[PDB]
Amino acid sequence: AKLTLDKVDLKGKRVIMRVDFNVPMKNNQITNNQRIKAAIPSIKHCLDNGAKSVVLMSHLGRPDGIPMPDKYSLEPVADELKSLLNKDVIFLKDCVGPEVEQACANPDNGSIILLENLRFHVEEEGKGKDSSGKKISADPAKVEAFRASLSKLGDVYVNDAFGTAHRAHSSMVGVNLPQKASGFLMKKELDYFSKALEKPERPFLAILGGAKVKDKIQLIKNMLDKVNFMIIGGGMAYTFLKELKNMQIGASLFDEEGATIVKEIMEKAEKNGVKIVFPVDFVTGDKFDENAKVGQATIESGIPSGWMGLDCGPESIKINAQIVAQAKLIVWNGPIGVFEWDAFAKGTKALMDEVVKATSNGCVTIIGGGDTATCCAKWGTEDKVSHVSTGGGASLELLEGKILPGVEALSNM
Ligand SMILES: Nc1ncnc2c1ncn2[C@@H]1O[C@H](COP(=O)(O)OP(=O)(O)OP(=O)(O)O)[C@@H](O)[C@H]1O
């Protein structure tokens, strides 16, 4: 329901665009330009649609409100963008100030400008850390002076940075322009999560994985008000199993605090006519380590002392397959085993295999931006599923029922 890039007339207008350029980079090298490739459609569309200019702002790393051009500069990204675009980019040493305003006042037609790391200013995030790592706070008055500067730099504002739309930062909620719209990536993020929330197709399956239960209560609860089925994997499972199946979980992880909301969750599951499924057998390790001895266990046998459950097993994979294959909409957030290690990634991979199969068969599949979005990368299925969120933190909040400021800041119609 929010304004989008292709619905705005960018004829002869300057465009201030907030994009995701937080790329892994060691020594100003950039070890994965993926996120930079991703923003090109939006920028291209602006040039191709008559934009006088396009001003790009972003952040990279953890400078926490201190300019740090030596390790978190966007400069290496600015000329990496030139390569990818086969067009020169003008890098500005800062993101605000007199120089930055003149440079973007009335640029030559079609020029592309990239401002320095926004987080070099404590006003962007609204918080920070000084020379000794201690937390400092931005002055609400300087924050608004910073935002007044950023707004001048453009005539139309475009947010194509979903990954930080769950945080009301300056670049996200502070640009005051008549039209604030979603970029092509952002638009896609919204288009799909809108599906899994406004009026989902059924059967709607929610696969929730992860380590602790305490920080998934909201996500679990909000999903129970919408889905038909729900699978819970990952370390969480052991908390529910010990509490619902009197299972000896050995030395597996256990969320003591979350264990007290279990019965509250199962209630929710019942009032909403949903039946959660958990593993039934497990792949174990004699220690939380990649090359640990691998063993097997079931709910009945439980994990031996010392050992711990690290991935679901053969019967769990089968049950999972059956349920995945009967869904029209699947939302997957969180692997169901320690995917970082192959000895215990089988369950997660099998699930991926099945989910990809569901996409081919008409099922819309949505993946969380965190640990799950990287799984598609490690196994090239980023183009075999309906959607892979480009932002873990934001997708989690969206799926939790929380308000995403960056989004509500966008214009309507
Ligand atoms: N059976 C398990 N035992 C111990 N740790 C596990 C197990 N399964 C998964 N994990 C761990 O869960 C960790 C992530 O936990 P956390 O809940 O913080 O993120 P998450 O639930 O995976 O969310 P997301 O996938 O969106 O980033 C992974 O790094 C993985 O190592």
- Domain borders along the chain are 1-185, 192-400
Q: How far apart are CA 351 and CA 346, in angstroms?
A: 8
Q: How far apart are CA 147 and CA 138, in angstroms?
A: 13
Judge whether 197 and 397 are in contact, CB under 8 Å.
Answer: no
357: part of which helix (H) or strand (E)? helix 346-360
- Here the tokens at position 110 are 């079609």
Beta bridge partners of 283: 296, 311
Residue from 253, 255, 371 to probe ligand 1 pocket by mutation (most atoms less than 8 Å from CB)? 371
CB atoms within 10 A of CB 210: 23
Q: How far apart are CA 294 and CA 225, in angstroms?
A: 38
Q: How far apart are CA 60 and CA 54, in angstroms?
A: 19
By C-alpha distance, which of 102, 121, 125 is closest to 113? 102
Tell me if 1-185 shares its fold with 192-400.
yes
User: At CA 85, angle to CA 82 and CA 88, rounded to 5?
Assistant: 35
Q: What is the resolution of this structure in A?
A: 2.7
CA of 55 to the centre of ligand 1 (A): 38
> Residue 328 burial by CB count (10 A; 0-12/13-18/19+): exposed, middle or buried?
middle
CB atoms within 10 A of CB 395: 29
Peptide bond preceding 98: is omega within 30 degrees of 0, i.e. cis? no
Q: How far apart are CA 375 and CA 312, in angstroms?
A: 17
**Non-local CB neighbours of 288 within 8 Å, separated by 6+ positions:** 308, 310, 338
Q: Which residues of 141-172 are buried (b: 16+ CB within 10 A; e: fewer)?
A: eebeebbebbbbbbbbbbbbbbbbbbbbbbbb
Q: How far apart are CA 328 and CA 358, in angstroms?
A: 8
Q: How far apart are CA 68 and CA 80, in angstroms?
A: 19
Report the greatest alpha carbon distance in the chain: 72
Q: How far apart are CA 382 and CA 387, in angstroms?
A: 8
Count of helices and strands (H, E) across the chain: 16, 17
Judge whether 399 and 223 are in contact, CB under 8 Å.
Answer: yes
Reduced to 3 states (helix: H, G, I; strand: E, B; else coil), residue 297 is strand
For CA atoms 377, 60, 39, 366, the dihedral sign is: positive
For the chain, report the end-to-end CA distance as a whole number of angstroms: 8
Task: Please give the C-alpha separations between residue 346 and each of 58, 75, 314, 335, 349, in angstroms, as whole numbers.
Answer: 37, 41, 9, 10, 5
Q: Is residue 18 among the annotated active site residues?
A: no
Read off the DSSP letter of residue 304.
P
By C-alpha distance, which of 78, 55, 175, 165 is closest to 123? 175
Task: Please give the C-alpha separations between residue 98 and each of 90, 93, 149, 295, in angstroms, as whole numbers.
Answer: 16, 12, 9, 65
Q: How far apart are CA 283 and CA 16, in angstroms?
A: 50
Q: How far apart are CA 394 and CA 192, in angstroms?
A: 13
Look up residue 156 and give its amino acid.
Answer: V
Q: Is residue 302 among the annotated active site residues?
A: no
Atom of ligand 1 nearest to the CA of 310: 1
Is 86 annotated as belonging to a binding site?
A: no
**Non-local CB neighbours of 31 within 8 Å, separated by 6+ positions:** 23, 24, 25
Q: How far apart are CA 127 and CA 240, in angstroms?
A: 37
Q: How far apart are CA 150 and CA 202, in angstroms?
A: 44
Look up residue 382 and give its amino acid.
Answer: E
Atom of ligand 1 nearest to the CA of 396: 26
Beta bridge partners of 29: none
User: Which CATH fold topology does 192-400 show?
Assistant: Rossmann fold (3.40.50)
CB atoms within 10 A of CB 112: 23
Q: At what angle do helices 184-195 and 392-400 cross, to 10 degrees?
A: 30
CA dihedral 182, 185, 190, 193 (to 10 degrees): -170
Q: How far apart are CA 101 and CA 99, in angstroms?
A: 5
Judging by DSSP bridges, how do beta strands 294-298 and 281-285 pair with one another? Answer: antiparallel
Atom of ligand 1 nearest to the CA of 336: 8
Q: How far apart are CA 112 and CA 89, in angstroms?
A: 5
Q: Which CATH number fits domain 1-185: 3.40.50.720, 3.40.50.620, 3.90.1170.50, 3.40.50.1260?
A: 3.40.50.1260
Judge whether 347 and 233 are in contact, CB under 8 Å.
Answer: yes
